[PDB]
Amino acid sequence: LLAEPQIAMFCGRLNMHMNVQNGKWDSDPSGTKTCIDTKEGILQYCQEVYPELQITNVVEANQPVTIQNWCKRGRKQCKTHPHFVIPYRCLVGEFVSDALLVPDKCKFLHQERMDVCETHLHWHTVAKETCSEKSTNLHDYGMLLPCGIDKFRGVEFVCCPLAIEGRKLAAALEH
Amino acid sequence: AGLLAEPQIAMFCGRLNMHMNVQNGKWDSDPSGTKTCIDTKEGILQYCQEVYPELQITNVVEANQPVTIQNWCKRGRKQCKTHPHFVIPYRCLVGEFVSDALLVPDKCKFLHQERMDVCETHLHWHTVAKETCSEKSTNLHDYGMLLPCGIDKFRGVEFVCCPLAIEGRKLAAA
Known about the structure:
CATH class of the largest domain in chain A: Alpha Beta
CATH superfamily of the largest domain in chain A: Amyloidogenic glycoprotein, heparin-binding domain
Strand order of the largest sheet of chain A: 3-2-1-7-4
Structural class of chain A: alpha+beta
Largest sheet of chain A: 5 strands, antiparallel
Largest interface: A-B, 17 and 21 residues
Radius of gyration of chain A: 18 Å
Number of strands of chain A: 12
Order of helices and strands of chain A: EEEHEEEEEHEEEE
Oligomer: homodimer
CATH topology of the largest domain in chain A: Sugar Binding Protein, Amyloid A4 Protein, Chain A
Distance between the termini of chain A: 29 Å
């Protein structure tokens, strides 16, 4: 398994999925599957595309990727017409939280509640607001404790200083 | 009802395989934009399963007559405007095998031959059918395979013989 299984969609075109052997995007195997509207449906598609793996849940990727050559159902031509989309990671087996890199002087934090079951977006906001409050930057975050298809009870994240001993601490991503 | 078109694949070396879109009845190119003509039955079978993931394809057999397929594609599917080609499709047989239903038109007869000791090709059986109608001064109108014994291998054939209706001739010579 040289790549993480995941699916990417763009309504109007056939779904794409990560080729776990080489690491490139391929198009829907049957040339018939279009964008999906529910988390339950996305999870099924993941399982249909990766029959050899035990897909047990799904979660949005933290950052968009650029995919080219989207095919259209019916059309012969898959025009290299780039699109920036947020893939869905097909999580496999027993759930384990993402390992996150903690750059020096940054802090690893996490929040959870046994009685809340929210989305990836909600947890992303929590993490962002928590770092923002302390006047810092959100460098990375991951979900914790799944409670449903693409639903979690918490978030683990990394907050970073605007600068260390005078020098600004930067990074680039997601837009 | 909500009946689908029989699944099948068509090849033309130097181009991407085509497969029948079972939902609209029209041909589509290779989903991955990389698969090309195959040279083994086992390979044909594997390709069927690949483009028809939701069907239990358990065998393959050549269709009886070639078909005209427009706009083939080259690897990558960036250039697909081309000259139509006459190719003989491969039927992707699903699930449990059952003999095709043959229409016996007026004045024709339905015959079938099965040899439980042999395991021949589609071509062999087509010939056995053609020759059997010839021996009775008739013409082979249609046929289908019987008793599968391997990937695209059968133990028999069912066919329909019909009146020749052909203009013969002789020679007037000195």
